[PDB]
Amino acid sequence: TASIAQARKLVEQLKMEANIDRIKVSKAAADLMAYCEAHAKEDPLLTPVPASENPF
Amino acid sequence: QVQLQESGGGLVQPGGSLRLSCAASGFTFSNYKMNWVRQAPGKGLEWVSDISQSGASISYTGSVKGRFTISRDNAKNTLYLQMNSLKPEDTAVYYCARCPAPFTRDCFDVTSTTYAYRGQGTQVTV
Amino acid sequence: EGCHVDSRVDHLFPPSLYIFVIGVGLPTNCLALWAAYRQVQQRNELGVYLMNLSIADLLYICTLPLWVDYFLHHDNWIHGPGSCKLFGFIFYTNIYISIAFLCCISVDRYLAVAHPLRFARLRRVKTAVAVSSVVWATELGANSAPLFHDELFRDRYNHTFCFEKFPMEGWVAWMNLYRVFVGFLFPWALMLLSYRGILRAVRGSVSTERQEKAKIKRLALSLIAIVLVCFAPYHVLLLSRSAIYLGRPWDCGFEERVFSAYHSSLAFTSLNCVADPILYCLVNEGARSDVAK
Amino acid sequence: DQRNEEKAQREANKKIEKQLQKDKQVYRATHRLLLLGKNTIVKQMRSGIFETKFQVDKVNFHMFDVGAQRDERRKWIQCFNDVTAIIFVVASSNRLQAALKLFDSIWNNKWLRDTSVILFLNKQDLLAEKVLAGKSKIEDYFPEFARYTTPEDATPEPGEDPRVTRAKYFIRDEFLRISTASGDGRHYCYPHFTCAVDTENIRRVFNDCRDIIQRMHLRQYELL
Amino acid sequence: ELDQLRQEAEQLKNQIRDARKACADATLSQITNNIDPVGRIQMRTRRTLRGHLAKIYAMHWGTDSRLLVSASQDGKLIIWDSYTTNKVHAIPLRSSWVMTCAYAPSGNYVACGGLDNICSIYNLKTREGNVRVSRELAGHTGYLSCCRFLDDNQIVTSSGDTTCALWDIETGQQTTTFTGHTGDVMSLSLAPDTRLFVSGACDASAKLWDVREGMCRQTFTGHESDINAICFFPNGNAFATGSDDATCRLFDLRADQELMTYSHDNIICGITSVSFSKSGRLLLAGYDDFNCNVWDALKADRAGVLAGHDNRVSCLGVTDDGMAVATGSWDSFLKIWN
C-alpha cells in the first residue's frame, strides 16, 4: 500500500506535468540564440577586453 | 529515460529451468557492470550474479554457483540470465540492476533500498 | 731545495676527464636543478637540498675550464694570481659542499622513512633553506683558510702552480688532514648510516613488495659506494702525502712518484659532478618523466 | 587616496597568512581516518559525521564516522580520498557478500585507488559458534569452503578447533583475492582479525598509518 | 490496484513523451549551423590563489565580481580579493567537510554546508569585527550539496536526502520543502529573477521548482547517469547539466527537452562543475581529467581547454560581470582565468 501510495503520488505529479503548455524547440532555440547574439559584445571571456580596462 | 523492464516468471517445481531477460533501454548497454539483485520474501535486496562490460569477469554468489548462468547480449540490450535447476530457495522478484557510472569497475550502490537505475522486476515463484 | 716532479699522465688524463665532465655533467646538473626547483614548488624539503647540491656542482663545472688549461700546460697558471685564488677556492671546497648536501639529503630521507610520524619542524622548507644557508656559510668559512695565505707558488723548474706547493707548507698539510677527515669521511659515514637505516625501515614495511625492496637496496648501495669510488683514491693520496710531509718535509721521492697519482685522482674526483644529477634526479622514474616533460 | 586602504589590506593579509601557517602546521600534524562498516572500534578508540579524537604515541588521529546519511555512498565517499586509511569493519561472522562488494567498490573506485584500507573482520565469537554448531551456513552460501583448507601461513594463536581458523582465513583470502587483483603499491588492504574483547586496535591502526606514510615518503623523496 | 497505478503512470509517461516528440520541430544543430563558430578561446592563468590546504570542493563569487569566497576540506572559508590576491577573512568552520559555500548578493553573509547536514550563515558586517555564526539551519537528513542565497533572511539549500529546502535565517525554520526526487540532489542554481530554481540529483533527472508555490512544475530526463552540476542560462529559460556519463546537456524549460549533448568519444570522465558565460555563448565545464573544457553552447563544437590543474576540477564560476573565471580544483588552488 505504501508503494501504491507512492504510485498515486507519482501519477498525480505526472498529471500535473501533463497539462503544462509547451513551445516548440525551434522558437525555444531561436530565442536562446537571439539572447546569445544580443549580449555578445558585453562578454570579456568571448571578446577580449583591452588590457587597460582589464583588471587582471 | 533509463528503463530496465524485466520479463519472465511463473511457478515451477524444484529443478525448474525457466528464464527470461530484461528490456534495457536509454543507455549504451556496453559501458556498465550490470548485475542481478533479487529481493526475498521478507528480506532485503541481495545480489546473485554479475557480468562485466563485455562479458569476461562473470562472478556469482555461492547459492547460485553452478546453477544459473549470466548472459549479456550487447546488440540485444538484454541481460539474458538463464536459471537452470531452480530451487525453492530463491522465490524472489528479480531486478536487472546497472552500474551507477560508465567506464568504471565499481558497483557502489546496487542493493540499496532505493535506486534509480534498477527497474521493475518480475516475480518468479518457486 | 724544492721537489722535482714530472708526469705526462697529468698532461693527458686530467684534461680529458675534466673535458668529459664539462661535456656531460653540465646539462644533467641543470636538469637536476630544475627538478629540485619543481620539488620545492610542491613543498618538498628534499628539493632545497638537491637545489643546493646542484648549484655547488654547477659552480665546480663553471670553474673547471681554467683548471683544464692549468693541467694542459704542464702545471703552469698563466691567468693571474687573484683569479687563481678565486677559481681555486671554487674548484676545491665544492667537493666538500656537495658531500655535505648529500649528507643532508640522506639525513632527511632517514628522518622521513624511519620515522614518518615524527619530527616535522625539521622537515619544513624554511628549515631546509636555513640548513642550506648554514652549510654554505660554514663550509666557506672553514675552507677560506688558503685565501688569507698566498697562492701561485712558482717552482724553480718550468712550473708555476696555483693552489698547491710540492715542497708543501705546514698549514696546507693540516688543512689537507682537515679536508680528508671532516669534509669527506664524516658526511660519507653519515650518509652510509642514514641509508642503512632507510634499508632497515624498508625491509620492515609490509606494503612493499620484493622487487621494490631490492631496487631500494641497489639504489642505496650505489649512492653509498659511488662517492667512495670517485673520491677515496684522491683523499687517500692526500693523506699519504701530508703524513709523510710531516714525516719528512725535505723528502721528494714520494711526491716525485705519486705526482701522476695525486693529479690523476683529482681528475677522478670530478666525476661526481655528473654522478649526482643522473643518480638523484634521472634515476627516479617520476623525476625522469618530469625531466622529459 | 588608496594608500590607507592598501595598507590595511596588506596588514589583514599578513595576519591571515600567519593564521594559515599555524593552521598548516596543525593540519599536517594530524591524520584523518574514515570508519566504515563499528561502534566497538570507536568506543575503544577513546549529525552526519561523528568526530572522534584520540592520541597514540603523541600523534593526533582524526577518525570520522558517518551516522546520518542514506544508503547511497557513490557521492559522499569521494570526499574521503585524502584520508590516511579507510577502516573497513566487516562482520565476517547474507551480509558477507554485501560487505565483500562494498570493499570491492571502495577498492576499484577511481578516487579511492590511492587510499589505503584497513580490514578488521569484526565477528569472531559468533563465527566460532556458527562453525562449531548449527546448520553450517558458511559452506551453503560459499561452496568453495569444502575445497579450501587451513593455510600454512596461518598462525593459530588461539588453539581452538581447526574449523573456525579455516573459515576465518577463507573469508580473509576471499577479501584478499580482490585486494590483490587489480591492486599495486597504491594501497595494500592490511588485513586484521578483531572482536569485542580486543583492546589493541588503536596500535594496529597506528602501525598501519605508519606504514602508509612510510610508503608515501618513499614515493615522495625519490627513495624507491 | 498497484498494477493499474503502474499502468496509469506508464500511459502518462507515453503521453508526455509523445507530446515532447511533437514539440521537436527542429534540432539545435539545424538552426545553429549558419552562425560563425566562436573560434579558439585561449585564456591564461591571470592569477593563482594559494593558501588552501585540502581539496577545494566549493567556491562562489560576490555580486561585485571582486570578492571571492572559497570552501575547502581543511575546515576553512577564505574570502579572497581577486584583484589583489589578498585574504579579507579566514573563517574556521566547525565541520571540515564542506561541499557548498554561498556569498550573499548584498554581502554581509556567507553560507557553508556539507556532511554535517547544517547550513551555517556567517555574518561579515559585524558590529565590531571578526566573523561569527548568525544562525545554524538544521532539519536536512542527507548531506548538503549546494546552498545559494535568495536574499537576506531567505536561503535555498540542496541536500542528499532527495529534498531541497527553503529557509529563513531569522526564525531558523524551513518555509517550504521540495520533494519528488529519487537520488541525492547534488547541485542547485537559481533563476536571475529569484522565482524558480532547478535541481539535478543522482537519478539522472533535473527538476524545476517554484520557490513559493512549492511544487515541481517540470522534470527533464535526458541523461544516463548522476547529474553533478546544474546552472541556469543567463536568460533564465534554459540550463545546463553535467553528469557522470561525460555528456553535458542543455535543457529548455519551455520545451522540457534536451537541446544539445556536448560530448566526445575522447572524454570518458564525468563533469563536476558547469557555469555559463555572461552572454551564454560559452559553456565552461569542469571534468575529472584534471581539465576544464570551454564549450560553445549554441554550436556543440568544443572551442577551448583550461589546462593547468594537476587534480580534479570541482568548482567553476563566471563573475557577475563576466570578466573572470575562477577554477577551484583538488590541488588547493583557485586559478582565475581571463
Coordinates of N, CA and C in Angstrom, one line a residue, chain D residues 34-183:
Chain D
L34 N 38.7 7.3 8.1 CA 37.3 7.1 7.9 C 36.9 5.7 8.4
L35 N 35.8 5.7 9.3 CA 35.3 4.4 9.8 C 34.1 4.0 9.1
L36 N 34.2 2.9 8.3 CA 33.1 2.4 7.5 C 32.8 1.0 7.9
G37 N 31.5 0.6 8.0 CA 31.1 -0.7 8.3 C 30.5 -0.8 9.7
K38 N 30.9 -1.4 14.1 CA 31.8 -0.2 14.0 C 31.8 0.6 15.3
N39 N 30.7 0.4 16.1 CA 30.6 1.1 17.4 C 31.7 0.7 18.4
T40 N 32.1 -0.6 18.4 CA 33.1 -1.1 19.3 C 34.4 -0.4 19.1
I41 N 34.8 -0.2 17.8 CA 36.1 0.3 17.4 C 36.2 1.8 17.9
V42 N 35.1 2.6 17.6 CA 35.2 4.0 18.1 C 35.0 4.1 19.6
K43 N 34.3 3.2 20.2 CA 34.2 3.2 21.7 C 35.6 2.9 22.3
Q44 N 36.3 1.9 21.8 CA 37.6 1.6 22.3 C 38.7 2.6 21.9
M45 N 38.4 3.4 20.9 CA 39.4 4.5 20.5 C 39.7 5.5 21.6
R46 N 38.6 5.9 22.3 CA 38.7 6.9 23.4 C 38.1 6.3 24.7
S47 N 23.6 14.0 13.7 CA 24.6 14.7 12.9 C 25.2 13.7 11.9
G48 N 25.6 14.3 10.7 CA 26.1 13.4 9.7 C 27.4 12.7 10.0
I49 N 28.3 13.4 10.6 CA 29.6 12.9 11.0 C 29.9 13.0 12.4
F50 N 30.3 11.9 13.1 CA 30.6 11.9 14.5 C 32.1 12.0 14.7
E51 N 32.6 13.2 15.1 CA 34.0 13.4 15.3 C 34.5 12.5 16.5
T52 N 35.8 12.0 16.3 CA 36.4 11.3 17.4 C 37.9 11.6 17.3
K53 N 38.4 12.1 18.5 CA 39.8 12.5 18.6 C 40.5 11.6 19.6
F54 N 41.6 11.0 19.3 CA 42.4 10.2 20.2 C 43.9 10.3 19.8
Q55 N 44.7 10.1 20.8 CA 46.2 10.3 20.7 C 46.9 9.1 21.1
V56 N 47.7 8.5 20.2 CA 48.5 7.3 20.4 C 49.9 7.7 20.0
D57 N 50.9 7.5 20.9 CA 52.3 7.7 20.7 C 52.5 9.2 20.2
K58 N 51.8 10.1 20.9 CA 52.0 11.6 20.7 C 51.7 12.0 19.3
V59 N 50.8 11.2 18.6 CA 50.4 11.6 17.2 C 48.8 11.7 17.2
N60 N 48.3 12.8 16.7 CA 46.9 13.1 16.8 C 46.2 12.4 15.6
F61 N 45.2 11.6 15.8 CA 44.4 11.0 14.8 C 43.0 11.5 14.8
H62 N 42.4 11.6 13.6 CA 41.1 12.3 13.5 C 40.2 11.3 12.7
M63 N 39.5 10.4 13.5 CA 38.6 9.4 12.9 C 37.2 10.0 12.7
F64 N 36.6 9.6 11.6 CA 35.3 10.2 11.2 C 34.3 9.1 10.9
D65 N 33.1 9.2 11.4 CA 32.1 8.1 11.3 C 30.8 8.8 10.7
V66 N 30.3 8.2 9.6 CA 29.1 8.6 9.0 C 27.9 8.0 9.7
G67 N 27.0 8.8 10.2 CA 25.9 8.2 11.0 C 24.5 8.8 10.7
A68 N 24.4 9.7 9.8 CA 23.1 10.3 9.5 C 22.9 10.5 8.0
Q69 N 23.5 9.6 7.2 CA 23.4 9.6 5.7 C 22.7 8.4 5.2
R70 N 22.3 8.5 3.9 CA 21.5 7.4 3.3 C 22.4 6.2 2.9
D71 N 21.7 5.2 2.3 CA 22.4 4.0 1.9 C 23.4 4.3 0.7
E72 N 23.0 5.2 -0.1 CA 23.8 5.6 -1.3 C 25.1 6.2 -0.8
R73 N 26.3 5.7 -1.3 CA 27.6 6.3 -1.0 C 28.4 6.7 -2.2
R74 N 27.9 6.6 -3.4 CA 28.7 6.8 -4.6 C 29.1 8.3 -4.7
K75 N 28.6 9.2 -3.9 CA 28.9 10.6 -4.0 C 29.7 11.1 -2.8
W76 N 29.3 10.8 -1.6 CA 30.0 11.4 -0.4 C 31.2 10.6 0.0
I77 N 31.4 9.4 -0.6 CA 32.7 8.7 -0.4 C 33.8 9.3 -1.1
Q78 N 33.6 10.1 -2.1 CA 34.7 10.8 -2.8 C 35.4 11.8 -2.0
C79 N 34.7 12.4 -1.0 CA 35.4 13.3 -0.1 C 36.5 12.7 0.8
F80 N 36.3 11.4 1.1 CA 37.3 10.7 1.9 C 38.4 10.1 1.1
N81 N 39.0 10.8 0.3 CA 40.2 10.3 -0.5 C 41.5 10.7 0.0
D82 N 41.6 11.9 0.7 CA 42.9 12.3 1.3 C 43.1 11.7 2.7
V83 N 42.2 10.9 3.2 CA 42.3 10.3 4.5 C 43.5 9.3 4.4
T84 N 44.1 9.1 5.6 CA 45.3 8.2 5.6 C 44.8 6.7 5.3
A85 N 43.7 6.3 5.8 CA 43.2 5.0 5.6 C 41.7 4.9 5.8
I86 N 41.0 4.0 5.1 CA 39.6 3.8 5.3 C 39.4 2.5 6.1
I87 N 39.0 2.6 7.4 CA 38.9 1.5 8.3 C 37.6 0.8 7.9
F88 N 37.7 -0.4 7.3 CA 36.5 -1.2 6.9 C 36.3 -2.3 7.9
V89 N 35.2 -2.2 8.6 CA 34.9 -3.2 9.7 C 33.9 -4.2 9.2
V90 N 34.3 -5.3 8.6 CA 33.5 -6.3 8.1 C 32.9 -7.1 9.3
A91 N 31.7 -7.7 9.1 CA 31.2 -8.6 10.1 C 32.0 -10.0 10.0
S92 N 31.9 -10.6 8.9 CA 32.6 -11.9 8.6 C 32.3 -12.9 9.7
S93 N 31.0 -13.0 10.1 CA 30.5 -14.0 11.1 C 30.6 -15.4 10.5
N94 N 22.5 -12.5 3.9 CA 23.9 -12.7 3.6 C 24.7 -11.4 3.6
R95 N 25.1 -11.0 4.8 CA 25.9 -9.8 4.9 C 27.3 -9.9 4.4
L96 N 27.8 -11.1 4.2 CA 29.2 -11.3 3.8 C 29.4 -10.8 2.4
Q97 N 28.4 -11.1 1.5 CA 28.6 -10.7 0.1 C 28.4 -9.2 -0.1
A98 N 27.5 -8.6 0.7 CA 27.3 -7.2 0.7 C 28.6 -6.4 1.2
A99 N 29.2 -6.9 2.2 CA 30.5 -6.4 2.7 C 31.6 -6.6 1.7
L100 N 31.6 -7.8 1.0 CA 32.6 -8.0 0.0 C 32.6 -7.0 -1.1
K101 N 31.4 -6.8 -1.7 CA 31.3 -5.8 -2.7 C 31.3 -4.3 -2.3
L102 N 31.0 -4.0 -1.0 CA 31.3 -2.7 -0.6 C 32.8 -2.5 -0.6
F103 N 33.6 -3.5 -0.1 CA 35.0 -3.4 -0.2 C 35.5 -3.4 -1.6
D104 N 34.9 -4.1 -2.5 CA 35.3 -4.1 -3.9 C 35.1 -2.7 -4.6
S105 N 33.9 -2.2 -4.3 CA 33.6 -0.8 -4.9 C 34.5 0.2 -4.3
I106 N 34.9 0.1 -3.0 CA 35.9 1.0 -2.5 C 37.2 0.8 -3.2
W107 N 37.6 -0.4 -3.4 CA 38.9 -0.8 -4.0 C 39.0 -0.2 -5.4
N108 N 38.0 -0.4 -6.2 CA 38.1 -0.1 -7.6 C 37.6 1.3 -8.0
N109 N 37.2 2.1 -7.0 CA 36.8 3.5 -7.2 C 38.0 4.3 -7.7
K110 N 37.8 5.1 -8.7 CA 38.9 5.9 -9.3 C 39.4 7.0 -8.4
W111 N 38.7 7.3 -7.3 CA 39.2 8.3 -6.4 C 39.8 7.7 -5.1
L112 N 39.4 6.4 -4.8 CA 40.0 5.7 -3.7 C 41.1 4.7 -4.1
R113 N 41.5 4.8 -5.4 CA 42.5 3.9 -5.9 C 43.9 4.2 -5.3
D114 N 44.1 5.3 -4.6 CA 45.3 5.5 -3.9 C 45.1 5.5 -2.4
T115 N 43.9 5.4 -1.9 CA 43.6 5.4 -0.5 C 43.7 4.0 0.1
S116 N 44.6 3.8 1.1 CA 44.7 2.5 1.8 C 43.4 2.2 2.6
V117 N 43.2 0.9 2.8 CA 42.1 0.4 3.5 C 42.6 -0.6 4.6
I118 N 41.9 -0.6 5.7 CA 42.2 -1.5 6.9 C 41.0 -2.3 7.1
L119 N 41.2 -3.7 7.0 CA 40.2 -4.6 7.3 C 40.3 -5.2 8.7
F120 N 39.1 -5.5 9.2 CA 39.1 -5.9 10.6 C 38.4 -7.2 10.9
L121 N 37.4 -7.6 10.1 CA 36.7 -8.9 10.3 C 36.1 -9.0 11.7
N122 N 35.2 -8.2 12.1 CA 34.8 -7.9 13.5 C 34.4 -9.1 14.2
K123 N 33.5 -10.0 13.6 CA 32.9 -11.1 14.3 C 33.8 -12.2 14.4
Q124 N 34.1 -12.7 15.6 CA 34.9 -13.9 15.8 C 34.3 -14.9 16.7
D125 N 33.6 -14.4 17.8 CA 33.0 -15.3 18.8 C 31.8 -16.0 18.1
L126 N 30.9 -15.2 17.5 CA 29.8 -15.8 16.8 C 30.2 -16.6 15.6
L127 N 31.3 -16.2 14.9 CA 31.9 -17.1 13.9 C 32.3 -18.4 14.4
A128 N 33.0 -18.5 15.6 CA 33.3 -19.7 16.2 C 32.1 -20.6 16.5
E129 N 31.1 -19.9 17.1 CA 29.8 -20.6 17.4 C 29.2 -21.2 16.2
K130 N 29.1 -20.4 15.1 CA 28.5 -20.8 13.9 C 29.3 -22.0 13.2
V131 N 30.6 -22.0 13.3 CA 31.3 -23.1 12.7 C 31.3 -24.3 13.6
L132 N 31.2 -24.1 14.9 CA 31.1 -25.3 15.8 C 29.8 -26.0 15.8
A133 N 28.7 -25.2 15.7 CA 27.3 -25.8 15.7 C 26.5 -25.2 14.6
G134 N 25.2 -25.6 14.6 CA 24.2 -25.0 13.7 C 24.2 -25.8 12.4
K135 N 23.7 -25.1 11.4 CA 23.5 -25.7 10.0 C 24.7 -25.5 9.1
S136 N 25.7 -24.8 9.6 CA 27.0 -24.6 8.8 C 26.6 -23.8 7.5
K137 N 26.1 -22.6 7.7 CA 25.8 -21.7 6.6 C 27.0 -21.3 5.8
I138 N 28.2 -21.4 6.4 CA 29.4 -20.9 5.8 C 29.6 -21.7 4.4
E139 N 29.3 -22.9 4.4 CA 29.5 -23.7 3.1 C 28.3 -23.6 2.2
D140 N 27.1 -23.3 2.7 CA 25.9 -23.2 1.9 C 26.0 -22.0 0.9
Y141 N 26.4 -20.9 1.5 CA 26.5 -19.7 0.7 C 27.9 -19.5 0.2
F142 N 28.8 -20.4 0.5 CA 30.2 -20.3 -0.1 C 30.7 -21.8 -0.3
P143 N 30.3 -22.4 -1.4 CA 30.6 -23.8 -1.6 C 32.1 -24.1 -1.7
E144 N 32.9 -23.1 -2.0 CA 34.4 -23.3 -2.1 C 35.0 -23.6 -0.8
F145 N 34.3 -23.4 0.3 CA 34.9 -23.7 1.6 C 35.2 -25.2 1.8
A146 N 34.4 -26.1 1.1 CA 34.7 -27.5 1.1 C 36.1 -27.9 0.6
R147 N 36.5 -27.2 -0.5 CA 37.8 -27.5 -1.1 C 38.9 -26.8 -0.3
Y148 N 38.6 -25.6 0.2 CA 39.6 -24.8 0.9 C 39.9 -25.4 2.3
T149 N 41.2 -25.4 2.7 CA 41.6 -25.9 3.9 C 42.5 -24.8 4.6
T150 N 42.9 -25.1 5.8 CA 43.7 -24.1 6.6 C 45.0 -23.8 5.9
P151 N 45.3 -22.6 5.7 CA 46.6 -22.2 5.1 C 47.8 -22.4 6.0
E152 N 48.9 -22.7 5.4 CA 50.1 -22.9 6.2 C 50.6 -21.5 6.7
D153 N 50.4 -20.4 6.0 CA 50.8 -19.1 6.5 C 50.1 -18.7 7.8
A154 N 48.9 -19.3 8.0 CA 48.1 -19.0 9.2 C 48.9 -19.4 10.5
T155 N 48.8 -18.5 11.5 CA 49.4 -18.7 12.8 C 48.3 -18.9 13.8
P156 N 48.0 -20.1 14.2 CA 46.8 -20.3 15.2 C 47.2 -20.0 16.6
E157 N 47.2 -18.7 16.9 CA 47.5 -18.3 18.3 C 46.4 -18.7 19.2
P158 N 45.1 -18.6 18.9 CA 44.0 -19.3 19.7 C 43.9 -20.7 19.3
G159 N 44.3 -21.6 20.2 CA 44.3 -23.0 19.9 C 42.9 -23.7 19.9
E160 N 42.0 -23.2 19.1 CA 40.6 -23.7 19.0 C 40.6 -24.8 18.0
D161 N 39.3 -25.2 17.6 CA 39.1 -26.2 16.6 C 39.6 -25.6 15.2
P162 N 40.1 -26.5 14.3 CA 40.6 -26.1 13.0 C 39.5 -25.4 12.2
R163 N 38.2 -25.7 12.4 CA 37.1 -25.2 11.6 C 37.0 -23.7 11.6
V164 N 37.1 -23.1 12.8 CA 37.0 -21.7 12.9 C 38.1 -21.0 12.2
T165 N 39.3 -21.6 12.4 CA 40.5 -21.0 11.8 C 40.4 -21.1 10.2
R166 N 40.0 -22.2 9.7 CA 39.9 -22.4 8.3 C 38.8 -21.5 7.7
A167 N 37.7 -21.3 8.4 CA 36.7 -20.4 7.9 C 37.1 -19.0 7.9
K168 N 37.8 -18.6 9.0 CA 38.3 -17.2 9.2 C 39.3 -16.9 8.0
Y169 N 40.2 -17.8 7.8 CA 41.2 -17.5 6.7 C 40.6 -17.7 5.4
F170 N 39.5 -18.4 5.2 CA 38.8 -18.5 4.0 C 38.2 -17.1 3.7
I171 N 37.5 -16.5 4.6 CA 37.0 -15.2 4.4 C 38.1 -14.2 4.1
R172 N 39.2 -14.3 4.9 CA 40.4 -13.4 4.7 C 40.9 -13.5 3.2
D173 N 41.0 -14.8 2.7 CA 41.5 -14.9 1.4 C 40.5 -14.5 0.3
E174 N 39.2 -14.7 0.7 CA 38.2 -14.1 -0.2 C 38.3 -12.6 -0.4
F175 N 38.6 -11.9 0.7 CA 38.8 -10.5 0.6 C 40.2 -10.2 -0.1
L176 N 41.2 -11.0 0.2 CA 42.5 -10.7 -0.5 C 42.5 -11.1 -1.9
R177 N 41.6 -11.9 -2.4 CA 41.5 -12.2 -3.8 C 41.2 -11.0 -4.7
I178 N 40.3 -10.1 -4.2 CA 40.0 -8.9 -4.9 C 41.0 -7.8 -4.4
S179 N 41.5 -7.9 -3.2 CA 42.5 -6.9 -2.8 C 43.8 -6.9 -3.7
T180 N 44.3 -8.1 -3.9 CA 45.5 -8.3 -4.7 C 45.2 -8.1 -6.2
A181 N 44.1 -8.6 -6.7 CA 43.8 -8.4 -8.1 C 43.5 -7.0 -8.4
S182 N 44.0 -6.5 -9.5 CA 43.9 -5.0 -9.8 C 44.4 -4.1 -8.7
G183 N 45.4 -4.6 -8.0 CA 46.0 -3.8 -6.9 C 47.5 -3.8 -6.8

